[PDB]
């Protein structure tokens, strides 16, 4: 039985990448009235983190907002070189950190939105965090029979560097499929149930609604697959329509993955069924991933409450 | 009968807006592998319109390129201040028209995607061109059951500035919906399928074929609809989930139009049917346009026979 303090300080993020118009919007409306992510007894703080690119409607300035949260990157001394992003990053570590420091933010929402397959979605960054694995339970409980898939990306060799990571506990909220620089009501709606069950979630653990022992299935990241790509660089064929928009569904090695504009089907290949992830990003097409591998697995959490 | 000249110059344009990708794929493909374009007879040449907003992934570096056209900008004179894209709009002039001229390009085909999901569509720019409404009729015979619509331009404001206005037969190639930056298999598949068949009614018809007269469905545009914006001149609210990705789907004076996060309703009310299109594009918020109305019309094309 674990026992955590009660959780003071809320931050919920939007504009990260400033073209994934979901977490724009509800940041600039809750900023502006914030009746629906108040909570008693919590200082829940909506925030945007890239004023300049959500501004310009564009994904980033000089590098990706979400890879440079590396303490390797937020003790560089300050210059004129000095990549915007970072100029903004040290300025988050150190308004809702210092990543990991006992003044850090107790929970960072960061929304973000994908033009793949892939639903409601979750995002935990340690499959030993009892208490937000208790925390996504109860959001797929709730949310029920609106599925809200997990995706665990722990390995240490591959986690830490993300906007959310300095949260004493940190929550990736994606949503989609939704075109980057578009807004779909129905995408809306579902960023902000996602966040009204988690928020609750917060007040509810305070309150002594002490929560039973239970476990969830999760999606845990094993390898990003790139597009093959020409001598050149360009790719050299595209996601095959059996693929496409199949994020979650298990597939075997002789199935359809990529196919060419000549026809030719280029299979999953290997000897292991697994699950498809970021299936067709467009973000990805520049980090070389036409999906990433994940295996699928279950994770238990000890019954929690507040101390 | 109507008469016609036999068509020989044949372009097709991809990546007017650098991340509209089926375009920039498909001619890059027939610009090695010409067979599928190839009617023998036809000099049919590919060409890649934008290829530094191409290398960035992006609409435009400067300016639109699909909007600079127009006879000032093509004889205009170079200052340091000028959006590139006009610098390159003199370029593709030079190289397929002159525009205007005797030695214009016969036929240009601009190939375009759209966030919205509006189908197969087909941009006609001459209500009274016998050749083209026939071309477009075989076009949607060659792909029914598939959804083939005619988008229909009659005010030269919107349309005399194309990059595809510069040939002697000007027409847009739209494919929707999908999300820019992004290469989705079926709609690669779908707009090439259209050119094939849009190259073949070309051969045919040099070859003497006649055409009896014909008919078609045409949807003329009427006028834009901007998002609803506040005074601080961000977007009040959002399309509609009943009219979100149901483009050509006609509305009626009740249908809700918009919709706030605080639950407001904006219904389209007015005084009479509209056939609503381009609903929720990705590179229009900033035109001011949730989605540009039209109307609905039949344009009959009479014989017509190479001489
Ligand atoms: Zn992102
Ligand atoms: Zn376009």
Redesign the interface.
């Given at each position: 039985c674990v026992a955590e303090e009660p959780i003071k300080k809320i931050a919920i993020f939007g504009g990260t990448h400033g073209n994934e118009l979901t977490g724009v919007?509800?940041v600039?409306?809750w900023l502006k009235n914030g009746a629906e992510v108040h909570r008693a007894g919590l200082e829940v703080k909506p925030f945007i983190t890239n004023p300049r690119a959500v501004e310009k409607?564009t994904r980033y300035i000089d590098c990706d907002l979400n890879r440079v949260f590396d303490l390797e990157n937020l003790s560089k001394e300050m210059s004129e070189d000095l990549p915007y992003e970072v100029r903004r990053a040290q300025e988050i570590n150190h308004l809702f950190g210092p990543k990991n420091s006992d003044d850090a933010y107790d929970v960072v929402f960061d929304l973000h939105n994908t033009?793949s397959n892939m639903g409601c979605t979750l995002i935990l960054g340690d499959s030993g965090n009892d208490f937000l694995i208790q925390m996504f339970h109860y959001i797929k409980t709730c949310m029920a029979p609106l599925p809200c898939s997990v995706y665990l990306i722990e390995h240490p060799s591959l986690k830490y560097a993300t906007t959310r990571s300095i949260a004493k506990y940190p929550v990736g909220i994606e949503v989609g499929?939704?075109?980057?620089?578009?807004?779909?009501?129905?995408i809306?709606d579902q960023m902000r149930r996602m966040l009204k069950h988690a928020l609750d979630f917060i007040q509810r653990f305070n309150e002594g609604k002490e929560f039973p022992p239970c476990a969830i299935d999760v999606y845990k990241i094993m390898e990003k697959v790139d597009y093959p790509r020409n001598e050149s660089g360009?790719?050299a064929a595209?996601?095959?329509?059996n693929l496409?928009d199949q994020d979650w569904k298990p597939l075997h090695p002789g199935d359809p993955v990529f196919?060419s504009?000549?026809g030719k089907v280029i299979p999953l290949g290997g000897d292991c069924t697994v699950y498809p992830v970021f299936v067709?990003?467009?973000?990805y097409?520049?980090k070389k991933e036409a999906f990433a591998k994940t295996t699928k697995l279950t994770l238990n959490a000890k019954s929690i409450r507040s101390t």
């Open positions: 919007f509800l600039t409306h409607c033009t499929p939704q075109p980057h620089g578009v807004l779909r009501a129905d809306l360009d790719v595209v996601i095959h329509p496409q196919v504009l000549d067709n990003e467009a973000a097409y520049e």
